[PDB]
From a paper:
Examination of the structure near the upstream ds/ss junction revealed the solvent-exposed aromatic face of a conserved σ2A Tyr side chain, Y217 (σ70 Y394), that does not appear to play an important role in the σ structure per se, but lies along the path the −11(t) base could follow from its position in duplex DNA (base-paired to A−11(nt)) to its position in the structure when orphaned by the flipped out A−11(nt) (dashed line). The −11(t) nucleotide is almost always a T, being complementary to A−11(nt), the most highly conserved position of the −10 element. Second, structural modeling suggested that the A−11(t) purine base present in the synthetic promoter construct may be too bulky to stack on Y217, which sits at the bottom of a narrow trough in the σ2A structure. (B) The T−11(t) base orphaned by the flipped out A−11(nt) stacks on σA Y217 in the us-fork (−11 bp) structure. The 4.6 Å-resolution electron density map (contoured at 0.7σ) is shown (grey mesh). We also identified another conserved σA aromatic residue (Taq σA Y217) that plays an important role in the promoter opening pathway, possibly by stacking with T−11(t) orphaned when the conserved A−11(nt) base flips out.
Transcription initiation is a major control point of gene expression. Here, we determine crystal structures of Taq EσA bound to an us-fork promoter fragment, as well as a complete RPo, refined using diffraction data extending to 4.00 and 4.14 Å-resolution, respectively, allowing visualization of key features that stabilize the upstream edge of the transcription bubble.
Residue numbers in the entry:
A (entry chain D): 1017 to 1238
B (entry chain F): 324 to 438
C (entry chain D): 2 to 57
D (entry chain C): 2 to 56, 62 to 1118
E (entry chain D): 1356 to 1505
F (entry chain D): 622 to 791
G (entry chain E): 2 to 94
H (entry chain D): 905 to 960
The structure:
């Protein structure tokens, strides 16, 4: 029931390596030249760092601050560009009317370990969710028909099926496969995900999507 | 003063690289929207408070303010337009005017615009 | 008078440019040092570029 | 009372931290130094170098320069909007090479700004600051080729603007093509005029091998020194003819000329001891009787080719190495502009000679003022390192003038920053603060000078290290440079210092900055104090070693954002520095000797000094500062007593009792109070407003000149044509407002009145005038009102009439006025506030003293901050700051905990054990006992483990007490809290940004003259920007018309924005827009490039963009 | 993204790429007015070929063209987009020379054009929507019989 | 830049619903001047437009008469509140104007996350959707209470904040 | 959380279609000063004010609650735009 | 114990099995309640809450 | 294509880059103004040289 523990453990504030440098040790620091140092920093922030540990830390710390703070601007370089190429993308035809489509695996081969395992939950959700079926599906009794709108439930159903080895490929409607001129279509796109329902026809889907990809931009340093 | 040349609108203001000189200048050339309505208001409110004037002392009260053809019409000509004399129109304006002053001081509808 | 759904852009010709113009400004004098009013040929000229005061 | 801690006693105190500004500027002044013994460096270098000015000719030489007496004191300037500058006279002699006319005359230069005591200058009444510039020290250097790893490219470089770049690159052509001033050419082309032919080219080169081939060339070496002197000159200058005498002059002036090439004394020094040579002047070569001998190029070239070989000792140099990087100081900077700005007059001298009356012209007609004067003022105003002084508080100016700017005209930019000049070199240490830097995109650019760090005339920042021998503390304090430091073994201030010797075998040490636990005896140096490892503000944070550097940075910078309070109070937990802070900042007035306070007089504090003389120091009580927070000297000295020399007399704005007092120590409960303190938010008790805590006063400047237009001038009076009765209230004589009058936003200050531009009133308006009868008078109202949101009271009444003594106004302007307006502001809702540990926040509402999580003693908490931004920001210092506060408030004694050396867990634990042990006395003694609610909480803890079971509540509440926590009730309910909540005194501060100012909203205001868009900032009174990101955000949702209004109706569109006000005023719906008017601009704009702007409609047809306008 | 912990959805990313490769290169123009090595959007070539098959002519042969997002945005049919984008100098020339007609196909072009955006509520799909209350609705429901007999 | 708009710092909304935002009095006044000018036209007190205009535009003398009158045009229509940068479309959400004291601006703590907000002194701006059409847009697809799911995930946005989580968990 | 939201969105297909309907109707409610509406004095928007509790003048809300009944008709190509302004701006002043 | 994730799943499942306004109110309920729920406990952070493992 | 070589000069309207005074007594001008100025100066002096019969250089 400790406040610090529960704090991050519940999902409020804090992360594991962050707690480590509080109740534990702060961990060996890195040199700005890029080669990590050869001496640890031991004592936690609660214990307090000696002048050395603190300076030696300040190296890669004040370094990192500059890393993130620098990439902040780079986010614009990404976003703006993505905007200028997505502006002309809107959902016009409800029906694009193409037999074209693409399939995604529910398993990603672990390199050098071979043996295709499975994509973690969020991963499958990362493009099966809110989709629209391209073709018939048969597994474990009840079969999906042509056209159904995949929901967070349907996705899990696909997982269950995949484990049964009855399904691997997932035929869906992609923006690529869409014949909607200067934009996409209902089927080819999907749920409005902010409404968890089919995207409103006339929506800024591409244009919105740009923002969707751009927002995470300042958050990837590594 | 004369000697001193003009000033480039691209001259940076402050110490930061954003601010421009020209972007710091207002536009009073065109009447502001607040003035669009302020003026269009008086142009009407003076039309309704005018109708309480005789068919002569009104249509004539406009000709002396450049309200009619936009150019001002002197007393001499107004008296020629109504068939009256360079004297009659003169008193007409006086009385017609203050006769409106009573309606103004009693309705407070136009009592603003005193700048 | 007509819904504008289209806007093109292209090159212009010396003639078309002559048409766009209301006159040929010559003198470098922006405005007088005294009257600060548009010079005869001044860049800011009020003679062929239209009045600074509405209808006046 | 007070209590100190730690066993690390600073041996040597902190040097005058304001000297890096003052002293360094003093060298370049030499005001007292006679015009003989002047050091020739700095200001006398501008004369030494730019003289004699020659042309049967003229030999005009330099003699002296008279140090001017300030015309107007630093005060007069600040109130006259004039620069604090003094006429610098100059004495010289004009002679002729033939006539022998020795004609001498004392000419005059211009006016040079003078520095104050603190280290800031005065520019047009606004005080500014000259920061420091950083770059690799001049000299020679060697680094691997950025285009190839297999070799090593070297280079040479003097002081900026005092000489051109130098580098000898090795192209992939196998030859060696040196590149200087952006162009390539083989080394032979140099050696030609250097006195080294084909023979001398192979003499010592064979000690290399493959390096003897890349140099030798027959197509060149057949050309002796004056023979090919012109050859390289042709490639150098495509314009001027390849004359044999032009290459005798130009190229010469670029090398052997110490006046056009100033190779900094450091460069002439540092480079001298590496390469193994004797270079005399600041030159490269020597103009020795005709051809040009070599003092530099060969001795560096052998090193360049030595490293690329692998021979021991010749190696790459560290570019970021502090020992290789000098600092441009105030005098060293100002002098830089004095010289070039003097040469700009040197040519103006040589030109005014070749004509007129060559017989005898006094140098008075020859010399000029403007070419020098304006050249200096240029740097003293529009340069980078000349920035607006920070007076937001006393510490502001201190740190501000103590910062190091990597920027400036002179060697870096926002582009080549990537890591190198951003990151922190291993040797930073006791030179520059590894943390305190702008948190913005400028990180690692503007740093701050370390405590004991000093910058000598050589630019090599040096750090104190207490010398030690045989493991014994020596009283010999060495200022060892960032260079030498990379040689010896430096111990640490936290080393086992006992009985003036080393205790434990394993001692803290390092070489070049690499941690090593080595034997005691071998310790040649040590760290004087941990304080030097950081900057000023950095060392103002207690238990800072517990706070992650990240937020600690903000904690250090925000020290400046903080604002003084009339009633403010020094932190009950200090580091033992803040004392001197107020002294060295010169923000406090002490006694020059041992005085005797005679008459306090909150204006004039007199102290009859022991020296028998009677001296008094007037007080600055309540006077405007560069931002809002005034300066105050609160007399703390009784109307008589004998003071001590150096003892304080009158306080300062952030200075309480000679201590740095930013905010006021306040008890804070760490807990989620109704989600009000959620996510670095703040909560405050009304009880603070009662005692007027964190409340300040802000003065502002309001000026207006009586404009003299073409239509004719005007005046500031009380008369106004349409003005009403009351609106004239405090105008009493000349149209000014009396002192101490409240001006709510919307009121006025002065009386400006000018003839309106005469224009016939609109017809409706003409009749409107006739009806009522107030005529349209010649003159219309002008007078300057007060800004929307700065309600003050008038204090400074400053009038300046044209035609008065010591006032020169603008050319053709009448009387002006600058009125001061001051206002008291209590802590408002949403005002920025932070602790010393770098935890930002805005006051979220307030809270009735009635409802408060008080304690058994009936003392309600005054703030209550949520424990959210503690773990993520790792601010564990604030935890101790408040933890001590618990015992602090109870025992009434303050603390001193130096950074990294201070009170620890056992110590604090004891202070809290005593705190509780005494607290119980005011309970059981006062006739009370253990409360039931207390039992509730105690039991809960006994279940959680916070209090060991089997122990009575007396022991449990005690253990919970030393934990920093206690039993808190709820002033809203009265029931206690399930868990305990830490509390106690903490140092916090109300930051600069206050909603009282920033917050703004407009309806329909002015617009940019160009396009009908509004105006950014609350200043010009305009709306915010909807820039492209916002537009896209709208496109996302799919709100069309919302975007329409943005692009047209609610922004720019001509008839649209008006039709809007029309509709809304008439209670209806606004029509859909048409012409954005900005776009209309774009049309003709493109047309100016002969771009036919063809607008089509619904089917490929003409459209008239500009309604009936340009249709000709 | 999944590495850094971003729950981002495939659709978006897909649209992007769709824009990247949506252009093709002209190879053996066949019977068309095109030239070997010219470039244009997938829909254009697809259309012209679809028509060519009916006209009897041989379809235009081609090969996929994968370019960068920037380059794509600068090659888009709408000249306005690239005009407001960047490298403005080069863009305007290329447009003006051939006299490029922007129909405001995209939104940003309309943004600058200060007109009703073809997307959102402004979408030509719903912007023509009508609204009537019962009373007035059945008021106008009768009027069509006032023009048939008269 | 636009007309009818402004900015200020931010303050948490512990009593505030998803569709709510604290809007300062003195702010909302000059923000809604064109509207209130009509609601004052209708509701007696000053005879006409200019009357009310100069009436309130002068001094600080705002009587309760104009307070309630202002609230009459406030209820219903909701104003858009934005926080820079505009990265996620959620960086702009529509909320119901709530006349409140003080200077700073309130807001729902759950949506602040989508705005990348924290109360360090952050400054948010505000605009007003004038035309009925646009206003409608503001209250429906543009409204905050409406879009609760992240368009880049499908997962919620207005999900419990760092604090609330700690409470419910506890 | 405008009442009937779920039902509102659920009525039409897209979001925009709905917004457009609410828009045009809300405007129509203003052009006729509320004497058009298909609702009843109990159903009409109610704004509670200290002075008196009147009908909420907000057009938007008017249209909002208006569609919830369904008495209103919509969709493209409904009736000729011509006679739609002859029998609309006539029946009400 | 209902922590972040569980709450998340609750929000989704609700918004899908219920509707916009309904779940809108639901959220605010957990907000207003959670704030006070946390308030009563208060759960402060002391230096002694940072306790170091004996295995260090 | 010959249009690329232009005889006329499309001169932008005056009010699009004006010169207007501000408070304090001094005026302010756009950059494009002085640019256009240098343009006509050379343009006129050229004519002056032409009819003059000045040499090729
Ligand atoms: Mg912030
Ligand atoms: Zn499709």
């Amino acid at each position: 029931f400790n406040p610090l523990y529960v704090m991050a453990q519940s999902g409020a504030r804090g992360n594991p390596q962050q707690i480590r440098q509080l109740c534990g040790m702060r961990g060996l620091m890195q040199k700005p030249s890029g080669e990590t140092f050869e001496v640890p920093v031991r004592s936690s922030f609660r214990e307090g760092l000696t002048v050395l540990e603190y300076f030696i830390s300040s190296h890669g710390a004040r370094k990192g601050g500059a890393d993130t703070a620098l990439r902040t601007a780079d986010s614009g370089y990404l976003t703006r560009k993505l905007v200028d190429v997505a502006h002309e993308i809107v959902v016009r035809e409800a029906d694009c009317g193409t037999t074209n489509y693409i399939s995604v695996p529910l398993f990603q081969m672990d390199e050098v370990t071979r043996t295709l395992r499975l994509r973690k939950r969020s991963d499958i959700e990362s493009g099966l969710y809110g989709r629209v079926l391209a073709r018939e599906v048969e597994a474990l009794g009840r079969r999906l028909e042509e056209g159904r709108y995949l929901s967070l439930e349907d996705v899990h159903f696909l997982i269950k099926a995949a484990e049964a080895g009855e399904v691997r490929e997932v035929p869906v409607r992609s923006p690529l496969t869409c014949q909607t001129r200067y934009g996409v279509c209902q089927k080819c796109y999907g749920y409005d995900l902010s409404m968890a329902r089919p995207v409103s026809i006339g929506e800024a889907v591409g244009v919105v999507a740009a923002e969707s990809i751009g927002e995470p931009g300042t958050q990837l340093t590594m | 003063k004369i000697a001193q040349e003009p000033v480039s609108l691209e001259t940076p203001i402050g110490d930061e690289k954003d601010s421009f000189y020209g972007d710091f200048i207002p536009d009073e050339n065109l009447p502001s929207p607040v003035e669009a309505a302020a003026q269009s208001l008086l142009s009407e409110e003076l039309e309704k408070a005018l109708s309480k004037l005789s068919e002569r002392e009104a249509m004539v009260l406009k000709l002396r303010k450049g309200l009619i053809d936009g150019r001002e019409h002197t007393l001499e000509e107004v008296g020629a337009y109504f068939g009256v004399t360079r004297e009659r129109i003169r008193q007409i304006e006086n009385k017609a005017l203050r006769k409106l002053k009573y309606h103004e001081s009693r309705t407070r509808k136009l009592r603003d615009f005193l700048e | 008078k007509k819904e504008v759904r289209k806007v093109r852009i292209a090159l212009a010709s010396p003639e078309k440019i002559r048409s766009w113009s209301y006159g040929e400004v010559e003198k470098p004098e922006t405005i007088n040092y005294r009257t600060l009013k548009p010079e005869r040929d001044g860049l800011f000229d009020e003679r062929i570029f239209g009045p600074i005061k509405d209808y006046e | 009372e007070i209590k100190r801690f730690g066993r690390i006693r600073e041996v040597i105190p902190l040097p005058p931290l304001t000297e890096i500004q003052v002293e360094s500027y003093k060298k370049a002044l030499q005001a007292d130094v006679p015009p003989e013994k002047r050091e020739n460096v700095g200001i006398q270098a501008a004369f030494k170098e730019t003289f004699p000015i020659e042309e049967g000719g003229l030999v005009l030489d330099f003699l002296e320069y008279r140090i001017g007496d300030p015309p107007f004191s630093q005060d007069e300037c600040r109130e006259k909007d004039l620069t604090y500058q003094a006429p610098l006279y100059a004495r010289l002699q004009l002679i002729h090479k033939d006539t022998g006319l020795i004609k001498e005359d004392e000419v005059f230069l211009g006016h040079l700004p003078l520095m104050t005591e603190d280290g800031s200058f005065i520019i047009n009444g606004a005080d500014r600051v000259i920061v420091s510039q950083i770059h690799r020290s001049p000299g020679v250097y060697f680094t691997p080729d950025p285009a190839r790893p297999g070799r090593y490219i070297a280079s040479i470089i003097p002081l900026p603007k005092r000489g051109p770049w130098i580098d000898l690159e090795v192209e992939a052509s196998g030859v060696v093509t040196m590149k200087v001033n952006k162009r390539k050419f083989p080394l032979v082309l140099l050696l030609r005029v250097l006195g080294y032919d084909q023979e001398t080219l192979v003499r010592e080169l064979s000690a290399y091998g493959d390096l003897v081939q890349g140099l030798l060339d027959e197509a060149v070496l057949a050309m002796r020194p004056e023979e090919a002197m012109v050859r390289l000159f042709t490639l150098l200058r495509p314009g001027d003819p390849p004359k044999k005498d032009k290459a005798l002059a130009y190229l010469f002036g670029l090398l052997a000329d110490p006046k056009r090439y100033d190779l900094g004394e450091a460069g002439r020094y540092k480079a001298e001891e590496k390469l193994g040579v004797g270079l005399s002047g600041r030159t490269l070569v020597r103009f020795e009787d005709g051809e040009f001998k070599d003092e530099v190029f060969l001795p560096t070239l052998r090193y360049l080719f030595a490293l690329t070989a692998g021979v021991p000792g010749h190696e790459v140099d560290d570019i970021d190495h502090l020992g290789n990087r000098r600092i441009r100081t105030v005098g060293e900077l100002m002098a830089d502009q004095f010289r070039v700005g003097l040469a700009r007059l040197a040519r103006g001298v040589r030109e005014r000679m070749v004509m007129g009356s060559p017989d005898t012209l006094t140098p008075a007609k020859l010399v000029n003022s403007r070419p020098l004067e304006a050249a200096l003022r240029e740097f003293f105003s529009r340069s980078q390192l000349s920035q607006f002084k920070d007076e937001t508080n006393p510490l502001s100016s201190l740190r501000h003038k103590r910062r190091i700017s990597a920027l400036g005209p002179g060697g870096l930019t926002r582009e080549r920053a990537g890591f190198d000049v951003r990151d922190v070199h291993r040797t930073h240490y006791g030179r520059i603060c590894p943390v305190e830097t702008p948190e913005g995109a400028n990180i690692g650019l503007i740093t701050s000078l370390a405590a004991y760090a000093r910058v000598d005339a050589l630019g090599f920042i040096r750090t104190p290290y207490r010398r030690v021998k045989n493991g014994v503390v020596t009283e010999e304090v060495v200022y060892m440079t960032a260079s030498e430091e990379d040689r010896y073994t430096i111990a640490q201030a936290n080393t086992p210092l006992e009985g003036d010797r080393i205790a434990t075998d394993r001692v803290v040490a390092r070489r070049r900055g690499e941690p090593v636990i080595v034997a005691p005896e071998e310790v040649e140096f040590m760290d004087v104090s941990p304080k030097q490892v950081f900057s000023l503000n950095t060392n103002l944070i207690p238990f800072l070693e517990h706070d992650d550097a990240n937020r600690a940075l903000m904690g250090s910078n925000m020290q400046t954002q903080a604002v003084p309070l009339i009633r403010a109070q020094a932190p009950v937990v200090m580091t033992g520095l803040e004392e001197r802070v107020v002294r060295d900042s010169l923000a406090a007035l002490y006694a020059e000797e041992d005085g005797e306070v005679v008459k306090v007089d909150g204006t004039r504090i007199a102290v009859r000094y022991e020296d028998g003389r009677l001296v008094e120091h007037p007080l600055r009580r309540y006077a405007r500062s560069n931002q809002g927070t005034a300066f105050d000297q609160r007399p703390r000295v009784r109307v008589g007593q004998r003071v001590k020399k150096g003892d304080l007399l009158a306080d300062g704005p952030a200075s309480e009792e000679g201590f740095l007092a930013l905010g006021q120590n306040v008890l804070v409960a760490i807990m989620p109070f109704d989600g009000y303190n959620f996510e670095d938010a703040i909560v405050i008790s009304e009880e603070l407003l009662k005692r007027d805590f964190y409340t300040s006063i802000h003065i502002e400047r309001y000026e207006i000149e009586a404009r003299d237009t073409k239509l004719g001038p005007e005046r500031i009076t009380r008369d106004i044509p349409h003005l009403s009765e009351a609106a004239l209230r405090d105008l009493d004589e000349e149209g000014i407002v009396r002192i101490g009058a409240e001006v709510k936003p919307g009121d006025i200050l002065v009386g400006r009145t000018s003839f309106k531009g005469e224009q016939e009133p609109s017809p409706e308006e003409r009749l409107l005038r006739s009806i009522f009868g107030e005529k349209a008078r010649d003159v219309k109202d002008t007078s300057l009102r007060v800004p929307p949101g700065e309600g003050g009271i008038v204090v400074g009444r400053l009038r300046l009439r044209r035609g008065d003594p010591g006032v020169e106004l603008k050319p053709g302007v009448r009387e002006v006025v600058r009125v001061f307006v001051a206002q008291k502001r209590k802590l408002q809702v949403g005002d920025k506030l932070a602790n010393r540990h770098g935890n930002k926040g805005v006051v979220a509402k307030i809270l009735p003293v009635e409802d408060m999580p008080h304690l058994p003693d009936g003392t309600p908490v005054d703030v209550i901050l949520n424990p959210l931004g503690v773990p993520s920001r790792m601010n564990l210092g604030q935890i101790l700051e408040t933890h001590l506060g618990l015992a602090g408030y109870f025992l009434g004694q303050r603390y001193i905990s130096p950074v990294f050396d201070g009170a620890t867990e056992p110590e604090i634990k004891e202070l809290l054990a005593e705190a509780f042990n005494l607290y119980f006395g005011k309970r059981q003694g006062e006739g009370f006992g253990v409360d039931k609610r207390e039992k509730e909480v105690l039991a809960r803890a006994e279940k959680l483990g916070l209090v060991s079971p089997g122990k009575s509540p007396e022991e449990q509440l005690k253990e919970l007490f030393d934990l920093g926590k206690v039993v808190l009730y709820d002033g809203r309910t009265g029931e206690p809290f399930e868990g305990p909540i830490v509390v106690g005194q903490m140092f916090i501060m109300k930051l600069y940004h206050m909603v009282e100012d920033k917050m703004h909203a407009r309806s329909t205001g002015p617009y940019s003259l160009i396009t009908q868009q509004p105006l950014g900032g609350k200043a010009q009174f305009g709306g915010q920007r909807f820039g492209e990101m916002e537009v896209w955000a709208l496109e996302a949702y799919g709100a069309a018309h919302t975007l329409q209004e943005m692009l047209t109706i609610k922004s720019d569109d001509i008839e649209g924005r008006n039709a809007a006000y029309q509709a809304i005023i008439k209670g209806e719906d606004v029509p859909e827009p048409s012409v954005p008017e900005s776009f209309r601009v774009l049309v003709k704009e493109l047309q100016a490039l002969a771009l036919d702007v063809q607008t089509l409609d619904e089917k490929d047809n003409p459209v008239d963009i500009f309604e009936g306008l340009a249709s000709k | 993204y999944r590495a850094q912990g971003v729950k981002l959805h495939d659709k978006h990313i897909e649209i992007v790429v769709r824009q990247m490769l949506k252009y093709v290169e002209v190879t053996d123009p066949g019977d068309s007015r095109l030239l070997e090595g010219q470039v244009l959007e997938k829909w254009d070539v697809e259309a012209l070929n679809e028509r060519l098959i009916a006209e009897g002519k041989v379809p235009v042969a081609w090969k996929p063209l994968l370019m960068g997002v920037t380059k794509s945005a600068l090659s888009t049919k709408s000249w306005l987009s690239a005009a407001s984008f960047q490298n403005t100098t080069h863009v305007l020339t290329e447009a003006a020379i051939a006299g490029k007609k922007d129909e405001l196909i995209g939104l940003k072009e309309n943004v600058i054009l200060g007109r009703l955006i073809p997307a959102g509520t402004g979408s030509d799909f719903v912007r023509f929507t009508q609204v009537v209350d019962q009373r007035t609705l059945k008021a106008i429901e009768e009027a069509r019989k006032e023009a048939v007999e008269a | 830049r636009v007309d009818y708009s402004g900015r200020s710092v931010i303050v948490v909304g512990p009593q505030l619903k998803l569709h709510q935002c604290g809007l300062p009095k003195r702010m909302a006044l000059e923000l809604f001047k064109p509207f209130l000018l009509k609601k004052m036209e209708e509701k007696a007190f000053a005879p006409n437009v200019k009357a009310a205009r100069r009436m309130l535009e002068r001094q600080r003398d705002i009587k309760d008469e104009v307070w309630d009158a202002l609230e009459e045009v406030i209820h219903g229509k909701v104003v858009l509140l934005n926080r820079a940068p505009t990265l996620h479309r959620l960086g702009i959400q529509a909320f119901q104007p709530v006349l409140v004291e003080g200077q700073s601006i309130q807001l729902h703590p759950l949506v602040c996350e989508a705005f990348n907000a924290d109360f360090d002194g952050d400054q948010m701006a505000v605009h007003v959707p004038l035309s009925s059409f646009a206003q409608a847009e503001a209250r429906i697809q543009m409204l905050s209470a409406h879009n609760l799911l992240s368009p880049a995930s499908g997962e919620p946005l207005a999900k419990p904040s760092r604090d609330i989580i700690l409470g419910l968990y506890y | 959380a405008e009442p009937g939201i779920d039902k509102l969105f659920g009525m039409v297909d897209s979001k925009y279609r709905l917004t457009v309907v609410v828009a045009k109707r809300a405007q129509q409610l203003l052009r006729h000063r509320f004497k058009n509406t298909v609702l009843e004095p109990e159903e009409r928007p109610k704004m509670r004010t200290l002075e008196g509790l009147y009908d909420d003048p907000n057009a938007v809300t008017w249209a909002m609650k208006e569609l919830l009944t369904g008495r209103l008709f919509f969709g493209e190509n409904l009736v000729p735009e011509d006679r739609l302004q002859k029998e609309m701006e006539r029946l009400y002043p | 114990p209902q922590e972040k994730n569980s709450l998340k799943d609750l929000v989704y499942q609700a918004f899908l099995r219920l509707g916009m306004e309904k779940t809108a109110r639901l959220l605010d309920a957990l907000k207003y309640y959670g704030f006070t729920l946390s308030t009563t406990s208060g759960i402060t952070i002391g230096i002694d809450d940072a306790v170091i493992p004996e295995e260090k | 294509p010959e249009w690329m070589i232009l005889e006329a000069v499309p001169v932008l309207p005056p009010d699009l880059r004006p010169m207007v005074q501000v408070d304090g007594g001094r005026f302010a001008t756009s950059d494009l103004n002085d640019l256009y100025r240098r343009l006509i100066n050379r343009n006129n002096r050229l004519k002056k040289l032409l009819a003059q019969g000045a040499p090729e250089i």
